[PDB]
Design a protein around this motif. Sequence first.
Motif, mmCIF file in Angstrom:
data_model
loop_
_atom_site.group_PDB
_atom_site.id
_atom_site.type_symbol
_atom_site.label_atom_id
_atom_site.label_comp_id
_atom_site.label_asym_id
_atom_site.label_seq_id
_atom_site.Cartn_x
_atom_site.Cartn_y
_atom_site.Cartn_z
ATOM 1 N N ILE A 90 47.226 39.187 33.034
ATOM 2 C CA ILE A 90 46.448 40.397 33.274
ATOM 3 C C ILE A 90 45.194 40.027 34.055
ATOM 4 N N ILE A 91 44.898 40.813 35.094
ATOM 5 C CA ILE A 91 43.854 40.448 36.049
ATOM 6 C C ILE A 91 42.481 40.383 35.392
ATOM 7 N N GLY A 92 42.137 41.372 34.565
ATOM 8 C CA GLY A 92 40.786 41.446 34.035
ATOM 9 C C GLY A 92 40.457 40.398 32.994
ATOM 10 N N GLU A 93 41.457 39.918 32.263
ATOM 11 C CA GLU A 93 41.220 38.975 31.182
ATOM 12 C C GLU A 93 40.838 37.604 31.728
ATOM 13 N N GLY A 94 39.915 36.947 31.028
ATOM 14 C CA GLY A 94 39.477 35.614 31.380
ATOM 15 C C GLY A 94 39.207 34.803 30.131
ATOM 16 N N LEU B 255 39.026 47.056 34.888
ATOM 17 C CA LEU B 255 40.255 46.279 34.768
ATOM 18 C C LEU B 255 40.832 46.279 33.361
ATOM 19 N N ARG C 200 36.849 32.378 37.531
ATOM 20 C CA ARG C 200 38.158 32.278 36.896
ATOM 21 C C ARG C 200 38.054 32.452 35.385
ATOM 22 N N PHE C 201 37.047 31.834 34.765
ATOM 23 C CA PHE C 201 36.854 31.988 33.326
ATOM 24 C C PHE C 201 36.432 33.403 32.947
ATOM 25 N N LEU C 202 35.637 34.064 33.788
ATOM 26 C CA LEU C 202 35.217 35.433 33.521
ATOM 27 C C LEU C 202 36.339 36.444 33.708
ATOM 28 N N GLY C 203 37.300 36.169 34.587
ATOM 29 C CA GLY C 203 38.415 37.073 34.780
ATOM 30 C C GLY C 203 38.361 37.900 36.042
ATOM 31 N N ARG D 31 41.338 34.265 40.300
ATOM 32 C CA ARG D 31 42.491 33.605 39.693
ATOM 33 C C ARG D 31 42.854 32.410 40.569
#
Lengths: 132, 85, 101, 77, 99, 136, 194, 138
Positions: B44-48, B57, E63-66, E69
């Motif tokens: 999922i794009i928004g998750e980090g 997102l 990348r960690f924040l989302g 990618r």
Amino acid sequence: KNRAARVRVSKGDKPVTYEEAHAPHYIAHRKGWLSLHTGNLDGEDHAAERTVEDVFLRKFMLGTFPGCLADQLVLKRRANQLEICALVLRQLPPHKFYFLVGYSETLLSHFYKCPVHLHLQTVPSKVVYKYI
Amino acid sequence: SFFTKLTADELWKGALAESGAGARKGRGKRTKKKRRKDLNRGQIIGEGRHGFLWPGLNIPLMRNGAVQTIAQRSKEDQEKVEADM
Amino acid sequence: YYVDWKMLRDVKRRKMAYEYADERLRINSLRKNTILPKDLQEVADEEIASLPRDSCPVRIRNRCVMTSRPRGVKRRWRLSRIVFRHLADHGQLSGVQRAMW
Amino acid sequence: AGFDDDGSEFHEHIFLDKYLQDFPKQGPIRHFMELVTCGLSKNPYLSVKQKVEHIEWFRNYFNEKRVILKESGIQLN
Amino acid sequence: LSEYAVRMSRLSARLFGEVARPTDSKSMKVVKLFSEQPLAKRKETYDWYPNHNTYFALMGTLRFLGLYRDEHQDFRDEQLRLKKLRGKGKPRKGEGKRA
Amino acid sequence: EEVVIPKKKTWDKVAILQALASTVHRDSTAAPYVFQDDPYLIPTSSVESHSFLLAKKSGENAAKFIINSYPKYFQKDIAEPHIPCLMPEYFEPQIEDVSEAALQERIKLXXXXXXXXXXXXXXXXXXXXXXXXXXX
Amino acid sequence: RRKALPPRTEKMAVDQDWPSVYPVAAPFKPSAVPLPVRMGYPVKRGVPMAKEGNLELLKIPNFLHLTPVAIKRHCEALKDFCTEWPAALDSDEKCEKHFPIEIDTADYVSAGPSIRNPKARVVTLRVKLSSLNLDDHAKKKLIKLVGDRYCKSTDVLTIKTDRCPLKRQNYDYAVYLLTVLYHESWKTEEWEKK
Amino acid sequence: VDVPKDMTKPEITISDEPDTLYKRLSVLVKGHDKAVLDSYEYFAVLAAKELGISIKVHEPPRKIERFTLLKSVHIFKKHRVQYEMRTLYRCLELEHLTGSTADVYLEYIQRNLPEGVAMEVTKTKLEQLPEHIRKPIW
RNA sequence: GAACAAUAGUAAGCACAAUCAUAGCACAUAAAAACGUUAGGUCAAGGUGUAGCUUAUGGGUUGGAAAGAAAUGGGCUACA
Ligand SMILES: [Mg+2]
Ligand SMILES: [Mg+2]
Ligand SMILES: [Mg+2]
Ligand SMILES: [Mg+2]
Ligand SMILES: [Mg+2]
Ligand SMILES: [Mg+2]
Ligand SMILES: [Mg+2]
Ligand SMILES: [Mg+2]
Ligand SMILES: [Mg+2]
Ligand SMILES: [Mg+2]
Ligand SMILES: [Mg+2]
Ligand SMILES: [Mg+2]
Ligand SMILES: [Mg+2]
Ligand SMILES: [Mg+2]
Ligand SMILES: [Mg+2]
């Protein structure tokens, strides 16, 4: 055999775009350059400064739009403001598209100390030029 | 070191070595397995990693008729989401 | 991180050369002249020798920005001959095309 | 646009002889400092303050190393 | 060369701001040193390598924040996960040699 | 006597741009300029247009939040004119020990405003009528 | 829920003003252009690719915002800012008599965040010695004083200044140089008698 | 039908300081492709004829920069790859302009300048004489 | 899987050809040259699958990396 910027021919079912379908010896003959600026002229300077920014923009946009990017970016540089033209598949909802474009048009401008414009063209799928 | 990274397609093409020179005539077939896994299947794009909730997102844009700000998941909620992943 | 430890050390060499650019420029004036007596020039030689080794611009090596290749790098684009070809053939660089004449 | 160079003029750059008053007029110090001034006047890459700092650096270096100029055989102040 | 001509040349250098009194080519080096910007101070030299640390840190934080990618980093993480699951991981610092 | 020298005209930096803008009026079949012109992103209803504007603003403020949270990644300046609006902002006081400098730093940047005054009054520091007006 | 909206082509008026659709530089969005344009190398049996999804069309700059109608409309509104050129200086023969001094200044534009061009510091000053009040002795002294900066055949003296970082400072230094040369060309010193 | 009313409101003032005169304005436009340069030349001529400038346009000779690199990666020097960079020039010669007319023409030119080209501007400023050279005696 | 006074050959496509560039044609040059062979060269442009290092096969400073008994490849200078 030349292999630079050359996609090999499969049994006859691979879809290839127009940019990929032409070898690098066709540049300025059948296809144009993906970026336009002034650093590559004769009596101009600051070529590597624009080149590193171009590479960073390519990688950053490839990571920002994962899987929905159809072709490579078109990076125009016109009077201190840089325009990024992209062809994007209509995979993401418009609410998520606007969030990303608004985030980018501020983050890139603040990172490169220059105004940035971002234009997206939504395509139903990847456009195939040669055999598919 | 960011400019030294490449695309996942090129990474998998070099990792699997599907177009290797030794596999053309038939010298291969010893390790007769070739599996490529798509890393963007359930991404999922928004998750980090930090578990930030963005209004555009992850979470819906509008709740209770009011605009949503940037949120962050709790430590245990983030661990539950990671366990599901 | 950086591309390589060689590039990381070259960054420090460039920073030190920029830091000591004024001191070396002022000192070399006392050494490259003939009006002043050699007695002070000999002492200025010791003064410039006492400077840190990485302060001189001579230790600076022009590598590639992308791959930090010590050789085969054009000065105009600061890129190696291989990365430059990989980008030009893709067409990400304006005005660059195969030479046909 | 956006660069005023502290509102300086051509006389603050080309004419730097006013900063050589604290030097022997008839010695080799003047011979060296006139060359330094001529080099600095033809330098568009530096501002007036940096040239003044270079002149001050030469002044204090010469005023600090007093034994060497007296030992060299030429009377300098 | 005449006495009038050398005086005229001396006056020309004084008026143009050049070197008035005669000087040697070996001594004109110190004139050129201040006439031209030093190489260590030039922007093309001291600003050659961009901040790769800044680029890498920004990309990793995104990348960690989302928002970003990184497919290369995801591939590295997947390969490391598979290697550790197989059983050949990274030994702890201080126990690789003795233990 | 025969020489004719006309006078010059002084205009603002955006005067000619406004004059050029006055030539082109609002279009009929064109979508608003803020929205993307692609049909997949063109709003269909008023609620959709409002949601798209809110999503764009949430992206902009989300990016600004990261910029403010990580100022060291934007300290490098490339433009010669040095535009200040693109520079990262700081929400931390410059001086912590001095009460007179902490109050003026914390008044402009709510919860910490009361704590600054509480710390200033802890050391029996005399506050004039100027800092107290801004704190109130 | 996927939605596919028809483009502006079906809604474009036949007599709709084009500058209203394309006022400024645009990335040539296919949805706002009703003109069917095919760009690209054709196939043996195929045809050049249409405007939808064509990267070649987006690569090239578009002058749709600079059509002749828009050029006329924009230039009509710019007549208020411009000034009238005096008719008394139609021919350069009178221009040389009235304003003999020519000031060449270099200005450059480049795409990017940077504006500082080191080539912009150079300022040229061209003066015809036939329009000045030098006497015979003063002219003969000035010719040798300037040296090669005076063209014997064209009778033009050129002063090229680059020492000052700023263009205004270079211009001030050039006018000072002209003044000091004119003043020193008249002074007869002791060594001139030999 | 819905045309806005009172759409014009500029800020134009005339100062008592005499306007600057220019003898020749040279515009050197350098680019990679000739079609963009031709379109820009047509645009500039159309813009200048409306203002009444009588622009003279000629094409300076092109400049080609060619360089050679290795074709392979590790060791192949007999085979090379040659790259070429073309630079085409257009010369716009304007005469009999004033300070404000040149300013507005340069504004209308640079505001619509393409992204793939650059422009060099050379102005021949007209001046009669400075104050200390008119009729002095030391 | 072929007989042109034709006996089972059609064939998208990739090659060749054509076109393009050396600012007018033609010629020439340049460029291009598919599928594959040599397990050809490149883990040392760069990333890399597998197997190995982690107070070391990692990271920093200084000093040295000769020399020719001899054989040979390619160029410059000549032997007039
Ligand atoms: Mg590595
Ligand atoms: Mg070196
Ligand atoms: Mg076939
Ligand atoms: Mg041809
Ligand atoms: Mg041929
Ligand atoms: Mg060949
Ligand atoms: Mg061919
Ligand atoms: Mg082998
Ligand atoms: Mg072999
Ligand atoms: Mg490795
Ligand atoms: Mg090895
Ligand atoms: Mg060492
Ligand atoms: Mg040998
Ligand atoms: Mg021989
Ligand atoms: Mg000989």
